[PDB]
Design a protein around this ligand. Structure first.
Ligand SMILES: Nc1ncnc2c1ncn2[C@@H]1O[C@H](COP(=O)(O)OP(=O)(O)OP(O)(O)=S)[C@@H](O)[C@H]1O
Ligand SMILES: Nc1ncnc2c1ncn2[C@@H]1O[C@H](COP(=O)(O)OP(=O)(O)OP(O)(O)=S)[C@@H](O)[C@H]1O
Ligand SMILES: [Mg+2]
Ligand SMILES: [Mg+2]
Lengths: 289, 439, 319, 282, 292
DNA sequence: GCTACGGCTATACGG
DNA sequence: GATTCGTATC
């Protein structure tokens, strides 16, 4: 029914990193097979964050999709299924000393397949040494929910470089720090990763207050339109940032991330783009005015 | 094709098996907790299994969350089995709480912690304690309402060791939450009771008439009433009652009706040992079933202390001194058997026989109480601290080694008297150590 | 060469029709198998009366060909920690296996009485999450070891001790299948020694056939011994001290029974002794406890047991 | 209560390396550390109060600016800080010059529980990226500072061994000799041997024996000396030996072991002393 | 001394002894000493056995003065032996010179290390003191390169692999297939080796007599992966791994890792038992997934 | 081509 | 299991 194959080193790297991050968001990864793109998205248990990765048809060198033969009509056909994040991220990993020359993912939900492949995702990996390894993880068909925040947000706009943001975010520790304060001044943009303190009964300290900050001027900011303080989580931002530079493309010169937020209540849009990969992150912001 | 307790779940507040007073004082607490400035931060629900603790919160959130939510419906239930790649197991609840803290304005959602994290591992239990302690003591201007439902069940014996803890014996709110959490101004606790016979009978009748054709086909419609009354009499669990009724209805033979057996409480066991149990006039059978079903509670020094404390409440202390002497002598004899099961059996049997021989109609018994031995231990600890202070000051200002035995005998009373006159007529410790001895 | 399956496993029932004992419960299991809507169930009873085999036969007749990938049998021999329960049970419950309209996946948890409490809470969560696709069957010796919230969602079925007639019927079926010589007195002795345990009856019968051939009372009582609870009960109920002392000596001390075993058996018998007064019962319990303490502390001689019997008789005949 | 200091790693390499080594040692030893800011020197203390104590002395000339003012005697500001936050700050600042820079690290005591405003700059390639940090600390009381004192060492049987400098020919061989006992997984006690010059590492157990000996030249600055200590302290000694050219080992007979490290800044010399108690008796 | 040997290539000894690390971390190790060399035989739960062959030519001072017995057997611990041979002999100018010694019964196993600057003497007390396939009933024989088998084993380890399967089927058209089917949390996992002569240099399937080369029938091996992962570190340094299995459910692995010019490498022999496989329908799914 | 350091993993510890 | 106070129902 659906067949997609990756035959590039960088594309495999970005695919594996996206799968790993979607696993770090929720234990189960939701993948929807469209006729133009392959969307892999994951929503938090508390429904406070949402990240979707759209692998277009240009990303794979074949995208044979046969929805006529989970199946949804919106006309365009949509097939969605639920797969384990940990099981999927241990398949797409790059072995040490062995190069993945081909990574093909498929699901043949037809009468041709037997029960050993029914409700079983088919992923085939061919190494450079001609060793063929293929797996059959279990999947569960579900219904896709197209939440509209990208069309709703297209409020200030921020387009900053992802390199220094990646350095600052990767230097943070999610164990001692769990909060992001992105304040933008009319001159400078400052992002500080802090943690609030909790006081005990007799003014004790239940939790400390570590504040690791960073401030950057306006010239490094590629584009800014105030048309401001927003507060949200840290780990999801770290993973969504580290997704991008996995596909090393020096010829491509984007290396930026676009931001959108309106008020402390409404969520913040977090977007980066690749040749055949569109990446989006949604996070519920802190409503404290 | 579906389970009856799942296909006949309540759709509104009127179909929930709950007392009117319980519904009222849960509704009031939940409504007060949705206010912009709520005195109570979290809501703690405790009770036995199948007492409509979880469902009533759902039906209340169906009508409270859509009302207080801002403009720009259900609960946000914690799920413990979720294994995230970059998430240590003890950090899962912390991440859940941090994510759920962003549910105040325009994202309002009640938080229902029905299944707690793994509290039988001590590290994550302490993490849970200090995580819910930070929520109560948080400096956040406003937080989403938090509801914690804890099922009070007795943990059966698993491993053999005398380092058994409170969580190892029974699974209750007292064993999970410490004293700081339970006795907190911003914590409201609403204990639950088993469903009474009336609501159970009404709901079983409703379920039966909802499937009238299937009971009339199996000619069980005429016998449904006695089954409903007997099931409502045996157990107070709505889920167990509905499951048993479904099992009886789907059956085609004379299989006897059986339900789950609820454990006997501590004061319930004390009353059973002292005053006996109705519908069972054989003391041997009652004691054997009590030891077979509640061996965890019976095989404890707390139970013998409870018997010693509460055996005088049989007739407000109006019985012969020979019976009391026999009871206390038997308890003292049992105390020398090093915790053998024969000791507990003999003690309970002797107490029951003694109270059965003197039992008469028209007796007006008293109220039983928990043993005061923990208060005595706390007083002894305070005395130990004060005696350590006395020995430290006596070994710092001068050289004098006195034994704690002499501190308790003579120096606990004579030395404060010496320091009193010495000071008023003119050292640090002037009051009697451990307070005065009264009566 | 040595290739011969023991009669316990060689004659293990493969269908619900071959299970004797609780006729009503087996009929209910057959009705469940023919209907398909198996609910969550808990099976408890004495060992060796047909709990594990009943669940396995029910699963076999409920799934058939799909039994290979439709059941998940976990027992005490396998790891059943909270991590194992989490991973394996969640993955098996989430699996979308196509089944007949009335068919469901079965999670057989044998020896559920020996599972950790955190695993029980994880099982509660899994039942509340995935009750519409898979069902849990519990096999245990006592239902008290399974926590109350787990029992709330389960239909408890209690297995009674096997009667003499059902044991005799199954035994006679095994004789007719194996074609060995037997005597009615020998079969009665086998049933009497089994004490309602079907596996014990099969083991004793197989040992008698393999050691002596013809199954009479003489051979059976020469290979297997009478149950020591009955001997202890006879010893405790003796009228005069001399007869009780003689029975104790010639039936437990010359036979090679440990004194601690005798004391524990006496405690159990006194706990389950009828036709005695409550005061007498508690006095004998106290005496047995004192003797137990003396045995545990090191003094485990025959003199202590003789003194225990003497004190029991003194309290029986008063003073 | 006005504490402020500025550190420039590129301007003065040796004392910055001394500070980094002290921070690494106090982080590896145990969580939290005691920073005693005397008006003329800074002492970093790791007091577990059997487990060892590290007493490092850092002169005021190490830092570019050392304004220390408090109402206590000799402007003694004593503070307890988590080493992990300070270690992370120091790693960031070390990578700042590693990527190429010469910016100074400004530290101020900005408010008993306070925090240090450790802020520095970094330039990627001509961009300005301000790195701001706030490490929560507690202010130790004056009497509580008096409860912490350096343990004096008796010289009745204590004997000094001048370990060879690591920059010399024998330095690498002696470092290998010191770490020769670290490659055993099941070792918890090292029983030293000095008879009057040899250093012998003896690990005697129920069914195995070890006889590491140093056959190279050694000096004793100016009789058997045996003390058995835990392996974890020996790892700290090996780490300290690699970072210090002037290393002095003192062994007391069945009493204690002293690992003295000195940095000749001449100027007041920076010194690190690691007092180690015997794990058990001979 | 009844036996003495000196060596300077401590890295080879370190890797050879580290091949036993996948086995019991801290248990006993049994050592034969004879004229040909010394060997390290290790067994775990009577289901798997490893064996080293350190030849005499590997050492340069092998003496073996013993004459009462043809071989000397001693049983000692393995962890401290590994730590002893873990010198890594750095500083190429001054090479560490080991000296193994044993003076018969009642003497410790001495390991003297000399650096001309550091002298270390390690003594180990000895303690008080099978799985072989018959060379007539071999079901299949395979010769796989070490790198491919190590990669397959590592991938199996990284996916859990509670149970593993071995597939060996020959065809009349000179086509050979070798795959590793695994039971894990994922379900059915297979890793089929290429049919080229670079990796699958030889694969012969017999009729249980080691002589008749029969085609079209597949040899199945059900092995517990706890025993299978014991060979993973052995295949890391292997240049060519030789696979053999008889009908009696015994798997033998011949590690051929081809420094002295005369010694013929280190010979590592791993023998492993096969699971009973009570479920007869599992092999049916194995062959059904193999046919597709 | 070699070394340092970061990430992955096996093992001991703790409660 | 007991007591004490408050309701709903017959
Ligand atoms: N009329 C009813 N009133 C209450 N519960 C009902 C009713 N009819 C069906 N039920 C079901 O009975 C079950 C009762 O579960 P709850 O008591 O709400 O859960 P609980 O209080 O957390 O018990 P535990 O401790 O989780 S076993 C639910 O599954 C309900 O859907
Ligand atoms: N009702 C029965 N009819 C025929 N054979 C029986 C019956 N009950 C038990 N057996 C035999 O008992 C053996 C296995 O019994 P099981 O059912 O496994 O024991 P159990 O009842 O599960 O008790 P436990 O708690 O598991 S030890 C087989 O040899 C069966 O043939
Ligand atoms: Mg519930
Ligand atoms: Mg069984």
């Amino acid at each position: 029914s659906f067949k997609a194959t990756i035959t590039e080193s960088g594309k495999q790297n970005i695919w594996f990193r996206a799968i790993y991050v979607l696993s770090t968001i929720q234990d189960d990864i939701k993948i929807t097979v469209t006729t133009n793109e392959l969307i892999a998205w994951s929503m938090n248990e508390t429904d406070t964050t949402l990240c979707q990765v759209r692998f277009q048809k240009s990303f794979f060198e074949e995208y044979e999709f046969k929805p006529h033969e989970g199946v949804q009509v919106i006309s365009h056909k949509l097939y969605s299924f639920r797969v384990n994040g940990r099981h999927l991220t241990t398949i797409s990993r790059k072995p040490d000393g062995d190069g993945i020359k081909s990574f093909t993912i498929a699901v043949n939900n037809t009468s041709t397949c037997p029960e050993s492949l029914a409700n079983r995702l088919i992923v085939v990996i061919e190494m450079d040494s001609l060793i063929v390894k293929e797996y059959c993880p279990q999947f569960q068909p579900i219904k896709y929910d197209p939440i509209i925040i990208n069309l709703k947000y297209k409020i200030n706009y921020i387009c900053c470089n992802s390199t220094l943001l990646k350095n600052f975010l990767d230097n943070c520790n999610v164990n001692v720090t769990d909060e992001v304060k992105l304040e933008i001044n009319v001159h400078r943009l400052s992002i500080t990763a802090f943690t609030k303190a909790v006081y005990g009964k007799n003014n004790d300290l239940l939790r400390n207050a570590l504040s690791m900050s960073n401030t950057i001027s306006t010239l490094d900011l590629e584009h800014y339109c105030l048309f401001k303080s927003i507060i949200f989580k840290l780990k999801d931002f770290k993973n969504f940032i580290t997704i991008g530079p996995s596909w090393k493309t020096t010829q491509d010169g984007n290396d930026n991330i676009s931001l959108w937020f309106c008020h402390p209540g409404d969520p913040i849009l977090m977007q980066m783009q690749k040749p055949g990969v569109k990446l989006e992150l949604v996070e519920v912001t802190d409503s404290n005015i | 094709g579906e389970q009856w307790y799942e296909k006949f779940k309540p759709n509104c507040l009127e179909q929930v098996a709950i007392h009117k007073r319980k519904l009222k004082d849960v509704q009031e607490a939940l409504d007060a907790m949705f206010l912009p400035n709520a005195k109570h931060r979290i809501l703690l629900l405790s009770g036995p299994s199948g007492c409509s603790k979880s469902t009533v919160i759902k039906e209340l959130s169906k009508i409270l969350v859509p009302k207080y939510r801002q403009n720009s419906h259900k609960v946000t239930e914690f799920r413990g089995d979720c294994i995230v790649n970059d998430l240590p197991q003890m950090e899962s609840f912390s991440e859940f709480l941090k994510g759920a803290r962003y549910l105040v304005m325009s994202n309002l959602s009640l938080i229902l912690i029905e299944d707690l994290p793994n509290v039988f591992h001590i590290d994550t239990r302490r993490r849970f304690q200090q995580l819910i302690l930070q929520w109560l003591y948080s400096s956040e201007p406003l937080l989403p309402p938090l509801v914690i439902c804890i099922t009070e069940c007795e943990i059966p014996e698993n491993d053999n060791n005398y380092r058994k803890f409170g969580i190892d014996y029974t699974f209750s709110a007292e064993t999970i939450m410490n004293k700081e959490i339970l006795m907190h101004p911003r914590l409201k606790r609403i204990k639950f009771n088993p469903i009474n016979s009336t609501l159970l009978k009404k709901h079983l009748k409703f379920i039966c008439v909802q499937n009238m054709k299937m009971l009339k086909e199996k000619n069980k419609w005429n016998k449904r009433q006695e089954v409903i009354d007997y099931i409502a009499q045996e157990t107070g669990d709505i889920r167990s009652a509905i499951t048993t009724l479904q099992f009886w209805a789907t059956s085609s033979g004379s299989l006897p009706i059986s339900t789950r057996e609820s454990t006997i409480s501590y004061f319930h066991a004390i009353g059973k040992v002292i005053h006996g149990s109705h519908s069972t006039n054989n003391d041997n059978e009652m004691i054997n079933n009590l030891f077979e079903n509640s061996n965890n509670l019976l095989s404890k020094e707390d139970f013998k202390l409870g018997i010693l404390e509460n055996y005088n409440t049989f007739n407000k202390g109006e019985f012969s001194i020979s019976d009391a002497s026999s009871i206390v002598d038997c308890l003292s004899e049992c105390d020398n058997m090093n915790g053998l099961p024969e000791s507990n059996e003999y003690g309970l049997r002797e107490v029951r026989k003694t109270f059965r021989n003197i039992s008469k109609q028209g007796h007006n018994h008293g109220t039983v109480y928990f043993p005061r031995e923990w208060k005595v231990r706390k007083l002894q600890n305070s005395f130990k601290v004060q005696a350590e202070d006395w020995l430290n000051v006596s070994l710092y200002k001068y050289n004098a080694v006195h034994s704690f035995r002499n501190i308790t005998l003579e120096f606990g009373y004579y030395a404060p008297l010496i320091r009193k006159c010495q000071s008023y007529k003119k050292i640090d410790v002037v009051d009697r150590i451990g307070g005065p001895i009264e009566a | 060469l040595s290739l011969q399956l023991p009669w316990v496993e060689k004659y293990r029932p493969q269908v619900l029709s071959d299970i004797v004992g609780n006729k009503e419960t087996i009929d209910r299991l057959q009705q469940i198998a023919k209907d398909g809507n198996m609910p969550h169930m808990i099976i408890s009873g004495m060992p060796g009366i047909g709990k594990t085999t009943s669940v396995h036969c029910l699963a076999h007749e409920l799934l058939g060909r799909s039994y290979a990938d439709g059941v998940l049998e976990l027992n005490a021999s396998d790891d059943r920690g909270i991590d194992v329960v989490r991973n394996q049970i969640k993955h098996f419950a989430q699996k979308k296996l196509h089944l007949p309209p009335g068919k469901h996946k079965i999670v057989i948890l044998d020896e559920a009485d020996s599972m950790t409490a955190g695993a029980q809470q994880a099982l509660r969560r899994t039942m509340e999450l995935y009750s519409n696709s898979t069902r849990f069957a519990f096999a245990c010796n006592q239902s008290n070891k399974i926590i109350e919230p787990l029992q709330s969602r389960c239909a408890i079925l209690r297995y009674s001790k096997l009667s003499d007639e059902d044991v005799l019927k199954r035994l006679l079926q095994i004789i007719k299948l194996e074609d060995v010589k037997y005597t009615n007195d020998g079969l009665e002795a086998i049933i009497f020694t089994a004490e309602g345990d079907m596996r014990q009856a099969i083991n004793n019968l197989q040992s008698t056939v393999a050691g002596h051939g013809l199954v009479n009372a003489d051979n059976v009582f020469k290979i297997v011994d009478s149950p020591h609870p009955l001997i202890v009960k006879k010893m405790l109920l003796a009228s005069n001290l001399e007869d009780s002392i003689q029975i104790l000596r010639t039936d437990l001390w010359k036979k090679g029974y440990s004194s601690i075993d005798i004391v524990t058996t006496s405690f159990r018998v006194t706990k389950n002794l009828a036709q005695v007064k409550e005061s007498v019962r508690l006095e004998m319990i106290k005496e047995i406890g004192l003797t137990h303490m003396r045995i545990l502390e090191g003094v485990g001689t025959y003199l202590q047991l003789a003194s225990m019997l003497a004190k029991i008789h003194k309290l029986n005949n008063k003073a | 209560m006005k504490l402020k200091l500025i550190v420039n790693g590129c301007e003065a390499p040796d004392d910055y390396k001394l500070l980094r080594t002290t921070i690494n040692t106090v982080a590896s030893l145990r969580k939290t550390a005691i920073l005693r800011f005397n008006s003329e020197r800074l002492t970093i203390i790791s007091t577990p109060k059997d487990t060892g104590q590290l007493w490092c002395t850092i002169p005021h000339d190490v830092f570019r600016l050392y304004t220390v003012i408090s109402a206590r005697e000799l402007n003694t500001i004593t503070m307890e800080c988590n080493c992990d936050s300070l270690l992370s700050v120091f790693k960031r600042y070390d990578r700042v010059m590693n990527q190429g820079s010469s910016s100074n690290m400004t530290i101020k005591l900005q408010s008993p529980i306070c925090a240090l405003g450790i802020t520095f700059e970094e330039i990627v390639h001509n961009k300005v990226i301000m790195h701001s940090f706030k490490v929560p600390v507690k202010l130790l009381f004056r009497a509580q500072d008096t409860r912490i004192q350096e343990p004096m060492i008796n010289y009745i049987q204590l004997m000094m061994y001048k370990l060879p400098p690591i920059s010399g020919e024998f330095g690498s061989a002696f470092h290998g000799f010191i770490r020769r006992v670290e490659r055993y997984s099941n070792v918890n006690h090292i029983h030293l041997m000095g008879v009057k010059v040899e250093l012998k590492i003896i690990v005697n157990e129920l069914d195995w024996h070890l006889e590491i000996c140093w056959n190279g030249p050694l000096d004793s600055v100016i009789s058997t000396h045996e003390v058995i200590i835990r392996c974890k302290d020996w790892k700290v000694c090996s780490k300290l030996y690699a970072a210090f050219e002037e290393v002095v080992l003192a062994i007391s007979h069945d009493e204690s072991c002293v690992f003295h490290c000195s940095l000749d800044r001449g100027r007041e010399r920076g010194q690190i002393i690691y007092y180690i108690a015997r794990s058990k008796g001979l | 001394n009844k036996f003495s040997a000196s060596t300077v290539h401590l890295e080879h000894i370190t890797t050879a002894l580290s091949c036993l690390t996948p086995f019991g971390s801290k248990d006993d190790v049994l050592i034969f000493i004879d004229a040909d060399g010394l060997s390290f035989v290790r067994e775990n739960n009577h289901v798997i056995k490893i064996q080293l062959l350190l030849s005499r030519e590997l050492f340069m001072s092998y003496s073996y003065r013993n004459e009462t017995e043809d071989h000397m057997k001693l049983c000692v611990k393995i962890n401290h032996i590994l730590d002893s041979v873990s010198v890594m002999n750095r500083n190429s100018d001054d090479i560490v010179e080991c000296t193994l010694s044993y003076d018969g019964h009642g003497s410790p196993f001495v390991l003297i290390f000399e650096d001309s600057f550091i002298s270390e003497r390690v003594e180990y007390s000895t303690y008080l003191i099978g799985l072989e396939l018959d060379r007539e009933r071999i079901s299949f024989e395979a010769i796989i390169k070490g790198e491919a088998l190590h990669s397959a084993l590592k991938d199996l380890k990284e996916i859990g692999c509670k149970e593993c399967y071995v597939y060996a089927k020959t065809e009349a058209n000179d086509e050979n297939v070798f795959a590793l089917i695994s039971k894990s949390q994922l379900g059915f996992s297979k890793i089929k080796l290429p049919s080229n002569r670079s990796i699958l240099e030889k694969l012969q399937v017999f009729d249980g007599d080691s002589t008749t080369v029969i085609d079209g029938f597949a040899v199945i091996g059900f092995f517990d992966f706890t025993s299978f992962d014991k060979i993973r570190k052995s295949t890391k340094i292997a240049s060519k791994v030789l696979f053999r299995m008889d009908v009696h459910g015994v798997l033998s692995v011949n590690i051929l890792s081809q420094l002295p010019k005369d010694y013929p490498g280190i010979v590592i022999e791993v023998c492993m038992l096969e699971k009973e496989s009570i479920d007869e329908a599992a092999q049916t799914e194995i062959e059904l997934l193999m046919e597709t």
